[PDB]
Amino acid sequence: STKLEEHLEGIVNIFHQYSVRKGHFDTLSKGELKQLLTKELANTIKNIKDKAVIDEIFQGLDANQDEQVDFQEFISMVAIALKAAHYHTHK
């Protein structure tokens, strides 16, 4: 595989470690997504200087905590958080 594909493989696997926990095996609730981001992007989130960004994301997840989201929506949200962090994923 390419480097990109190896990285994606790893992300796919992590997403599914969360999505299999309840209900349909490859979606998770917005409530569950909030937990995932909180733990798995802990350093990225601390690196976001404007705290309204995750405030807003999490407020949206809270507003529809039982709505299901797929990999594509997960990675979209991750990309938002990444950009807000200036792409800083390190402690």
Q: Does residue 8 bind a copy of itself (CB under 8 A)?
A: yes
Out of a copy of itself, Na ion, none, which partner does residue 66 contact, by CB within 5 to 8 A per kind? none
Shortest Å distance, C-beta 5 to a copy of itself: 4
6 is in an annotated binding site: no
Coil, strand or helix at 3: helix
Token digits for 8? 């994606």
Does residue 65 bind Na ion (CB under 5 A)? Answer: no
CB of 46 to Na ion, least distance (A): 27
User: Per CB under 8 A, does 75 bind a copy of itself?
Assistant: yes
Helix, strand, coil fractions of the chain, as percent rounded to 5: 65, 5, 30
Query: Which residues, other chains included, contact 31 with Cβ-Cβ below 8 Å and sequence gap of 6+?
Result: 61, 62, 65, 66
Other beta carbons within 10 Å of 72 = 8
By CB under 5 A, tell whether 19 contacts Na ion. yes
- Binding site listing for Cu cation: 16, 26, 86, 90
List interacting residues with Na ion (CB under 5 A). 19, 22-24, 28
